[PDB]
Subunit: 286 residues, 3 copies
């Protein structure tokens, strides 16, 4: 048994096929809780959550066993989604620590074994916390990897050499970190819904100071009250520095809701600093 | 000497350049028999076997030595082909076992060293027995690998870590399993020709039960006598289950010729079961 | 710490971000001399050397420290370029030996860590001395690798397993060998300019003898005096054999300037042999 052959064998029973039929779409997912909670990506079941009348998500295990599915919740802003299999034994995956992942580590982008176009690709960690563009469109602070990510392993986990989940694949290959995955899944399980910060700002990238040049501020938004104007260039949102519009959408998510936060920007070349109170995007869930 | 550096060095003298000139086309191949039998893929020499008057296939070894070639036989249905070098010493490759290959094993997609666009790529086994579409067109029950397969290593072997051939490259990278390779090469050497099963059925894929929806049945075919109609959906051919039209063409090849075999299909949603006697595709060679 | 994780960690401080602003363009480079000499590729700073009035190349280290840059020299014919950081401590990279590199060795295509689209890809050596086509356009006798080369690691080094530079990345992935890199950088530092051989010949590829069919000979060139005509097919330039026009441009560079050299060619199918005295491309620097 080789190095990568043993890792894919242990975690295989913890990887699952996810398919919604009507047509049809198929994907992958990982078993993260013994109660029957399976984590996938939102675009896999995105067609099962916008059309619930003509679709029926099913769960195919590694041993061929089928079972119905139950959508616990999803998060299109970080492209995560949690499913439920009631009264199923269950091979629980081992969840890793994304903060301990370093550039250079060997990883495995596992897909569901019984899948039609399943993959199992191997690479290393090419980048950490890379904002990548990807139901509302979004951008994620992802783990980059030279292991190929396609329809096969999309949904499946990004496994380290200790057979532990360092991320969840999404579709030069990118994965959502496991630490951002656990936080979203822990509040998608409990609260059935996540609440992300918001400032009400449409931005565009620039490369001249660079950053996210503001396009349109929402009327009544926290940004409109903190003094952010159009045409200024956001160079730092809070403790994070903003390199372009892709990193701008990711920086606002790490801001505490209600806590007044600083936002540095350059308007007419002149560097101003701006205080904003991040609103919740879900006024009914917060 | 590294791990992959030693494997490619031992098997290098067993990998060969194959080139037909007139324009011209070049490829790769492996030495599998001491008598001078070299295995390649059919599309490499496909232009040397349909135009034998304006072409002349030649064999370039790792030590630069050239020699003429002799087409023993080919199989476009599994994209295999065997050549012959008379009175040549000869580095015989070690043939592996495809059934022992597991997802995760490190592999090497070797190409002919002296080739113009030669490659030597490294990956793992991404999938086993994946029907892939690819002279009559066909589909093969291939070994998938994340190692790149291109014009360089096309023809060359897919080598495991024990420096043993687990497959032969063909042109997200796919290879023909060595066990299906040996069987085809053993009867392409002896009988000079392979004979594959046939039922006389044109099929199309569907994803609603799914499977291979039948398009046109050949008049007088075994399928026309066993009761298979048009518009029904083939869900299983024999002991194999049919997921789409690509897997359908692969399942019929494993059926014994003359032996009555079952074929389950759904016509008007109603699941019927059908007995068919697979014909040989070569009535003169069987 | 994994195998590839330790190699990328040691050499990380020796890899540098290179950016010219006005927009703007960013790249990568390696620290090869303690005096502050940083090597990159010419197309990275190509916009900083043709437009010096509206651009300002800057150097960002791994520890975030910025510093201005100083163009010591560049070579578009082998796509190399050397920069200068005065009075900077400095993590000097360990330079490897390209002649000791064998097909199969694990390599790391490192990019600048703080880069916007930085990569760190891992592969093996797929080919040695592969002429690849790539300010005057050119072709290089490059190291091929299955590790992905993109805008991220372009400029950065191709690191072996001993944390030593075997090449410099350029943009199925290719790198300029470190031995050809040192020679160009040693005379780009000293003489501020490289001088490459020239014969005055425009060639085109052919695959029938094959080689580089001559298109246009420059009036007064060494080729026009040694007896090379148009329409003949160059099959060998010196000790090198010419397989196509891409290898032809690389073979002339290894010829000594002034030393009469042989050039074998086939005109009307008849094999002639031709003596040429390679001119310097820079009559003022030689």
């Amino acid at each position: 048994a080789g190095r990568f052959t043993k890792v894919a064998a242990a975690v295989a029973d913890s990887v699952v096929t996810i398919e919604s039929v009507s047509e049809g779409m198929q994907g992958s997912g990982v078993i993260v809780d013994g109660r029957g909670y399976i984590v996938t990506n939102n675009h896999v079941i995105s067609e099962a959550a916008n059309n619930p009348s003509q679709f029926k998500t099913t769960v195919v295990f590694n041993d061929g066993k089928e079972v119905p599915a139950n959508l616990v919740g999803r998060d299109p802003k970080t492209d995560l989604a949690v499913l439920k299999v009631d009264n199923v034994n269950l091979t629980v995956a081992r969840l890793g620590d994304s903060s301990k992942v370093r550039v250079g580590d060997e990883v495995l982008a596992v897909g569901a074994p019984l899948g039609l176009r399943s993959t199992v690709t191997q690479g290393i960690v090419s980048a950490l916390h890379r904002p990548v563009p990807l139901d509302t469109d979004t951008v994620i602070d992802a783990i980059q990897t030279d292991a190929s990510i396609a329809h096969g392993n999309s949904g499946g986990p990004l496994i380290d050499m200790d057979a532990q989940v360092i991320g969840i694949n999404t579709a030069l290959g990118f994965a959502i970190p496991v630490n951002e995955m656990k936080l979203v899944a822990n509040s998608l399980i409990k609260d059935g819904k996540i609440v992300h910060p918001t400032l009400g700002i449409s931005t565009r990238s620039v490369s001249n100071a660079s950053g996210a040049q503001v396009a349109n501020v929402k009327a009544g938004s926290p940004a409109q009250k903190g003094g952010i104007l159009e045409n200024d260039v956001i160079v730092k949102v809070g403790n994070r520095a903003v390199a372009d519009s892709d990193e701008f959408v990711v920086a606002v998510r790490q801001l505490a809701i209600g806590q007044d936060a600083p936002i540095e920007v350059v308007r007419e070349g002149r560097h101003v600093t701006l205080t904003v109170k991040p609103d919740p995007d879900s006024t009914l869930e917060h």
